[PDB]
Amino acid sequence: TGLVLLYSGVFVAFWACLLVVGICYTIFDLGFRFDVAWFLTETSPFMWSNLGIGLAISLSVVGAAWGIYITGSSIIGGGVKAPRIKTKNLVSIIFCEAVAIYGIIMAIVISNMAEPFSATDPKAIGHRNYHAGYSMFGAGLTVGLSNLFCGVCVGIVGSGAALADAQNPSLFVKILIVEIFGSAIGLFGVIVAILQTSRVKMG
Amino acid sequence: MKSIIPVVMAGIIAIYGLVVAVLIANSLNDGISLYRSFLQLGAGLSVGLSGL
Amino acid sequence: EMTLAQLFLQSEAAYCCVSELGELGKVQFRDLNPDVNVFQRKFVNEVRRCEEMDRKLRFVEKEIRKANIPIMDTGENPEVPFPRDMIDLEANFEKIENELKEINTNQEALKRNFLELTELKFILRKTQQFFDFVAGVINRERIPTFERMLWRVCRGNVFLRQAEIENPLEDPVTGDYVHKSVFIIFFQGDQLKNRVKKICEGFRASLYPCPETPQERKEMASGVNTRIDDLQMVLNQTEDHRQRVLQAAAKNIRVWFIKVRKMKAIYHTLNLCNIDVTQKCLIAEVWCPVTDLDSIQFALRRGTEHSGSTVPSILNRMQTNQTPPTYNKTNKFTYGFQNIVDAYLTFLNSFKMKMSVILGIIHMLFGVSLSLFNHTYFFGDTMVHQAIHTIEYCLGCISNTASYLRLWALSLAHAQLSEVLWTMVIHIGLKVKSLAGGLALFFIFAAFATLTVAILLIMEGLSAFLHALRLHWVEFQNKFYSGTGFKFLPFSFE
Amino acid sequence: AAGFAIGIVGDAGVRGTAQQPRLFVGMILILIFAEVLGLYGLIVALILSTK
Amino acid sequence: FPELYFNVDNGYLEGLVRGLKAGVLSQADYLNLVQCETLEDLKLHLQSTDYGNFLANVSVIDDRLKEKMVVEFRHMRNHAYEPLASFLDFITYSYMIDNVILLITGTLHQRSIAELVPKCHPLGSFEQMEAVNIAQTPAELYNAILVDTPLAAFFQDCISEQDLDEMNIEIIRNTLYKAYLESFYKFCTLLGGTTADAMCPILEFEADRRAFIITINSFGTELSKEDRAKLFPHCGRLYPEGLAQLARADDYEQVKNVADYYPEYKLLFEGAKTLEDRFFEHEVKLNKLAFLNQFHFGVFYAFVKLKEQECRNIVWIAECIAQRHRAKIDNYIPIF
After folding, report:
1. Are C160 and C225 in contact (CB under 8 A)?
2. Greatest pairwise CA separation for chain B in angstroms
3. C217-250 and C44-66 are packed helices; what angle lies between their axes, rounded to 10 degrees?
4. C466 and chain B in contact, CB less than 8 A
5. Best of A89, A163, A168 to mutate (most E CBs within 10 Å, chain E)
6. Which among B8, B15, B26 has CB closest to C346?
7. What Pfam families does the database record attribute to this sequence (chain A)?
8. N- or C-end of chain E: fewer Cβ atoms within 10 A?
9. Which residues of chain E does A72 touch, with a Cβ-Cβ cutoff of 8 Å?
10. Smallest Cα–Cα separation from C407: which of C455, C475, C371, C356?
């Protein structure tokens, strides 16, 4: 592997700096200089909030587009000898496209609750406002990344069902139940996402 | 039964770590000095990593 | 303390001496003609004769179980059969062999004869009932799809008669115990005969010739009636002839095993004789204990009398440079314990470590002192060898005495988990306020009964037992034992 | 570590016991030595959490 | 983890070779071809299957069948990018080795390159690397031409001066096949995951056929026990121990008891169907098992070794029909 040596050469190196930077903050006295409080407070509540709206739709469709091309190559691959697959097995495309709907439904919801203010001090920016910031990041993270994983889930099973239906016509309606449990995780993403943004209000 | 002698000598490496681990855990106390603690950290790395 | 002391034979006493010598079990016959193939060992023609009776015995022990006959044992070490009796055995062994091989092929042809004639007999009644060309038999499960195909490809028609036979019959492999049905293929055309015979084989129907004329059907029905009952007579008469010689074999095969198996064993040692040289007398170069030199010689004097030979055999003594194989007591509750070695909180920490280290030094002291008594019992390369001898003892005993420190620390592992186990037994189960004394203590005391033995006695027990072997093998047998070894392997019975 | 040590020889043991029944007593020996590593972690976890 | 990729590059070609698996004649397809009685009726039933209209224009059944599996194999190699195009090149090396030994014979006996086109397998062919077409030089100035061919790295155990009649014609095929099986195992070990547990069991048994069939025919021959030792591929299950006891064999039962140490290769020595008809049914049992796994490259090599069984079986049906000896017609390999 050539290009994998770059990421595995940086991740070991960056962790090796942060290890020895870590045993040189404690060992002198300089743990007061670390300040995870100053990192979460002084930056913004908007950098977390606006990233979460972006990661809500974008990381869902990067699983939805991932789910399409895995089984879309297997539709046209088996479709050469068995052309009857092109009508029945398009629901495998839909279940790896309805995951993108779960993002865009959520992404409008999280953007509906973001509102500006005038404060610039982390004591003026109250805990009602900072909690509104991270909750958009967390709910945008769990509707984006979980939809990525259920997007690749139904796509891989969709590629296998396109190959199994090429050999036998009666099989595809039996393997379709596997794609339901794969696409059920997309349903499990949005229930968390609205619940993390239920009690949230900015201002 | 003749070929169990390599895997038991790897078992000596485990109890070599277990001997040191109960020594460092029993010398632990609230408010030990910094010279006391750094001696125990290099004691744990020496038996463990050479045992690795 | 063995000797390769020579022993002479005379070939009139080559069986009856060796057999009573093999009825003792203290002898270690050694082959001293290795420059020869596996054949031409003086007796290859006769050991195959024992092997042919062995092949007949391994075959007759299989067929005695398929008829499910109880086997007599009467367990005792019998008398080994002489070569005088050997030729009389193959008359008796092959009599049982040829009769039972013939019968199982004859009864299967007779059973095939019995089912075919009964299948032909049942179609004679049903068709003469319907009467008052092809006739054949087909099973009930395939008859509606048969007439659907018969109407299809014949397509003029054949007037099919449907009539089901009674209680199920069986053709031997197809079909096993099914009630079938007859049919009638008249059609009068003699061209569609080809177009129905393919269908009769395609549906796997069994067809038989019917006489087709009136009162000859009942004539052949009377004929097959007398033929079947005579066939029914001889079928069971072969069967009562069968079981009367199975139980005659059942009183035989158990002792008949150890007749020839003892003969095949001693004849294999008759292949192991000296060099097959130049006269009608033999030599044997065996390993023998000095404590048993007299008892094997009186047994050798016993063996020459059992053949009736007038000349006793002798026993020469000598000395050479070869392996002295080991021999000892071999006691019963000493057999398994010998075979294992033949395979090869702060105050307690300071005290139990040093006393165990001196105990390992004491175990190494008793081991290294045994090397001096073993050495008393009997330059450039000597320097590099004794350097490897000495300094591997130097750094080696450190790793030995470090592995003596575990047997206190494993007891510290024994102590801590027993309290946690103990804690569950004394705390989660018994400290329940309302519903304790019934279902709550019962599942926890069962965990105190069953779950502690698998964890503290099974796996912790076997590991320390495997550790104690390592304390014996690499830490105690490395001081005096040379570890070369050579076993005795006496000429046994079974 | 005990989970890694079990999987390698547990796979190697069941690939061999289909080929020879003699290994089935020797397979359970090496699996015990792959299990006591997890037991050594437990008894030091208990002695570190009581204090 | 190595399965959510591999459909970037080999998505379409994987579904293609699964579609060509359905064109394999099944068990019910085999039964109707036994019922044939002439070659014209053999032409009629094959028109019902996927082969149809291939005899529109008994030894012509040999060529017109195997020419179909060449163009089907050549069409698959035209679309594999880089993770697979070298892998399909490894399947052709078994046919290039059988071609090149056929070529050094006419080179040694001064029989020119005019016999090359009609008398070689089209799978491993020489229609590129045009230096080999011109070479008539007697096997020493041709080995310098031979290294401009992907069989060059397998000739590192072939000394050029050892080629000139000191080695037998058959011996140089097996030590080239020995060099071929070590490389294709190591190449399939560099690839990991699903193509390393569905393919390497096939290559272990294929190296163990070359363990047994060598020593069972090396009895009356005057090749010593050190010659058959280095003609064994050091690849399969028999490597550290079974290769040692096969050298000292000298007898048919002495190769049987060394196969009795493995329960897979015993119960296959009960042919006592012959031995190679029992090794063939286990081989197609392994190639059928490779069709279970999905995201791996072993589905292509399992297709070719089964497609050569398809061209083998139809000819054996045809040879029992044309010679009218269909009492042994049921001795084919029913792969599906």
Report:
1. no
2. 51
3. 120
4. yes
5. A163
6. B26
7. ATP-synt_C (PF00137)
8. N
9. 11
10. C356
CA E154 to chain centre: 17
What is the signed CA dihedral for E122, E127, E128, E133, rounded to 10 degrees?
120
Q: Give the count of beta carbons closer than 10 Å to the beta carbon of residue C474.
A: 17
Closest among C68, C134, C56, C130 to C100, alpha carbons compared? C56
DSSP states along chain D: -HHHHHHHHHHHHHHHHTT-TTHHHHHHHHHHHTTHHHHHHHHHHHHHH--
Cβ–Cβ below 8 Å for E262 and D19:
yes
Please, which residues have CB within 8 angstroms of residue D25's CB and are 6 or more apart in sequence? none
Which run of H or E residues covers position B24?
Answer: helix B11-26
Amino acid at residue number C165: I
What DSSP assignment string belongs to C107-165? HHHHHHHHHHHHHHHHHHHHHHHHH---EEEEEGGGHHHHHHHHHHHT-S------EE-
The reply to whether omega before D7 is within 30° of 0 (cis) is no
CB E318, CB E39: distance < 8 Å: yes
Give the amino acid at E97: I
Beta carbons of A61 and A103 less than 8 angstroms apart: yes
Determination approach: cryo-EM
For residues A4 and E235, give the distance between their C-alpha atoms in angstroms, rounded to a whole number.
Answer: 30
Chains B and E touch (3+ CB pairs under 8 A): no
Rounded to whole angstroms, the Cα distance separating C288 from C298 reads 14
Q: Which contacts of E267-273 are long-range, i.e. CB under 8 A and separated by 24 or more positions?
A: E273/E331
Query: What is the DSSP code string of C204-238?
Result: T-EEE----STTTHHHHHHHHHHHHHHHHHHHHHH
Q: Which of C71, C185, C66, C188 is CA-nearest to residue C135?
A: C185
Distance from CA of D11 to the nearest CA of C (A): 20
E247 in Cβ contact with E223 (< 8 Å): no
Residue D50 touches partner E, C-beta closer than 8 Å: no
Ramachandran angles phi, psi of C9, nearest 5°: -130, 175
Tell me which residue has tokens 């799809």.
C145
Measured in angstroms, the CA of B2 and the nearest CA of chain C are apart by 7
Alpha-carbon gap, residue C367 to C202, rounded angstroms: 85
Question: In this structure, what are the phi and psi dihedrals at residue C157, rounded to the nearest 5 degrees?
Answer: 180, 165
Q: Which residues contact A137 (CB under 8 A, 6 or more apart)?
A: A48, A49, A51, A52
Number of separate helices (H) and strands (E) present in chain B: 3, 0
In the complex, which subunits touch A with 3 or more CB pairs below 8 angstroms?
A: E
Strand-by-strand arrangement of the C163-164 sheet: C163-164, C180-184, C135-139, C206-208
Distance (Å, rounded) from C-alpha C44 to C-alpha E255? Answer: 23
- State the Cα–Cα distance between residues C481 and C476, nearest whole angstrom: 9
Q: Is A166:A82 a contact under the CB 8 Å cutoff?
A: yes
Count of residues in chain E: 336
List the one residue out of C127, C139, C116, C113 whose CA is nearest residue C204.
C139
**Burial of residue E146, with CB atoms counted within 10 A of its CB: 0-12 exposed, 13-18 middle, 19 or more buried:** buried
Among B5, B24, B29, the residue to mutate for chain C (most C Cβ within 10 A): B5
Long-range contacts of C292-301 (CB under 8 A, 24+ apart): C292/C26, C293/C3, C293/C5, C295/C24, C295/C26, C296/C21, C296/C24, C296/C26, C296/C27, C299/C20, C299/C21, C299/C24, C300/C7, C300/C17, C300/C21
Gap between the Cα atoms of E184 and E87, Å rounded: 9
Tokens of E105: 């014979």
At C6, give phi and psi (nearest 5°): -75, 155
Resolution in A: 3.8
The answer to whether E206 contacts chain A (CB < 8 Å) is no
Q: Residue E277 to residues C494, E209, E332: CA-CA distances in angstroms? A: 42, 12, 9
